[model samples]
Target: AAQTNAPWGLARISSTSPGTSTYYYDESAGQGSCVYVIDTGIEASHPEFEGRAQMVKTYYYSSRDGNGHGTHCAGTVGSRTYGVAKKTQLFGVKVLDDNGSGQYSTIIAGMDFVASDKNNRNCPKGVVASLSLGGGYSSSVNSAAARLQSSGVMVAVAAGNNNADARNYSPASEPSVCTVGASDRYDRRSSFSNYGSVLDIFGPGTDILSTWIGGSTRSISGTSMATPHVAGLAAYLMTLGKTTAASACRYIADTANKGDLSNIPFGTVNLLAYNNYQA
Candidate 1:
C-alpha cells in the first residue's frame, strides 16, 4: 500500500530508529537554500515542484529528463510531497544524456556552472549540489566537485552501486564531498551499494518512490537515490544556517541514526541519514 504523510525515506529520517510511518517537518524547511541537482535534467513542470524547480543550466542537447533519473532525485531533494527540504528551490543542472551516460567534461561543466552561482541567492542562506552519478576515479571530476565545496556548496554524491570499495570511485572518493551509500528500509546496506571508508553516511534507496517525468511517479533504487536524500537534508540544515560545506556535512553525521545499521561491509561507517525534524 502507498503510505501517506511521508514516504519511507522521509519517515526514516525523523525517528531516532527506523519503523516510523509518518514524516513531520517544519513547513519552512529549506526556505532559504538552493539545491542544484547535477544529473539528468528535472521536469520542472511537475506539480511536485510547486513552481520552485527549474532547468537552470545544461551542457547537454536539452534540459529534459528523458531518463527519469534526475527528476526522481529532484523530487527527493525538494518536491512538495516527497522531499527532505520541501521548500528548497530545486535547480536542475543537467550533464548526463537521456541514456544516463556522459563525459567527464560535461559533468565538470555542470559543476562549474553551480560554482559560478556561488554569489547568487534564491533564498540566500546556502548552496547545495547533488551528484547521483559516479564511475571510476577521475581527478578532473573530483576537483570540479571539490571546487563547489571550496565555494561553500554542500555536496552530496553517490558512492556508486558497484558493490565494491567506494574509494574506487571519483567524487565519492573525494574527501571534500559527503559520499553516500544505500540502505534498504530494514536498515541493511543494499545488495548492490558500494561500501568503504569513503562513505560518510547511508540513505534509504531501495524501491524509493518519487516524482518522475510526465506528471507521474516511479519507484527505483541506487546510491544515486541515496545521494539526493543527503542533498535535501543539506538544504534543510542550510535553512537553519548550516552554510559551510564542512559544517553541513558534519551536522549530518552528528545527527545520524548512529550505529544502527546492519549488514554493512568492512570499511563502511554505520551511520544513517537523519532529518532531526523536531515538532
Candidate 2:
C-alpha cells in the first residue's frame, strides 16, 4: 500500500471552524456589488453570509430547493469572509427542484427574470449570473443565453461534472456562454471536469471549502462548485473597471494560475490578460 498526500490538506480545511476564509482574496476587497445566482433558492441564514446575501428575486417555477444543493453552492460564491467582499450581494433564483431536474422553459423563465427589472430594479446593469447546474442541449437554449449576453448580463455556467467533452453541454457549448471547467487545489483538472477547446477557462472545483446552512460548513465537489469561483472573480473584476461582460470574462481566463501543479491533469489555461485588453 502507498501513502497518499492530499493537496492543500482539503480534509483538514473542511474539518476546521466555521468562519475560516479562503486564500483567493484580492488586495482591494470586493466593491460592494451584486450578482444573480440562477439556481435553487438559498438558505438565507448562514452566519458566514449574515447581512451579506440579498434576495433580489426568487423563482419557484418548481418551488424552492427541498434539497440542500442550492444553498451550498450559493454560499461558496457569495459568502462574506471577514475583510473580504463583505458588501457583495447575491440574488438567488430557484428554477430546479429537489429532484435535481428542471424544465428548459423554467430555466429560461428564470433567466428572463434575471434580465428584466420587471418588478425589482435591483439589478439594472444586469448582474453576472452563475448557473451551477446544466443538462441536455439546445441551440434555442444557447440563443436564450446569448440574449442575456447581448443585454449586458454575463453568464457563468458549469461545464458539467461528468468529465464528458465540454461540447456536449448546452449553454456550456454556447459561444455566448462562459464555460467553466474545474481544477483541484493544486490547479489540476479534476477527473470529473469536462474539457474541450470550447472551455473558456478553469477555476477551483476540487473538495472546495465553503459554507453550508445551519451554521455548519463542509467541502463540496463539482463543476457546480467551480463555476462560482469564476463568478466571484467576475464580480470583483467588474467592480475594478468599466469592463464589458466579455472583457471581464477575458480577464478571468487570462489571469488564472497555470501549470501542472496541484494534480492539474492539463496545462494551465491563461485568458485573463487577453480579457483585460482595451480596444
lDDT of 2 by residue, 3-90 (tens): 1232132211221212222333343334455667777777667677776665555555433445666776776666764112334577
Clashes of each: 0, 13
> What residue runs in model 1 are displaced by over 4 Å at the alpha carbon?
1-4
Off by over 4 Å in 2: 1-28, 56-64, 82-85, 122-126, 260-279
lDDT of 1: 0.87
* lDDT tens digits by residue: candidate 1, 136-242: 99888899988888877899999999989978799899998999999988898998899998889999988888999999998999999899999998888778764
CA error at residue 122 for candidate 2, angstroms: 4.4
Compared to the true structure, candidate 2 yields what TM-score? 0.80
Candidate 1 local lDDT, residue 48? 87
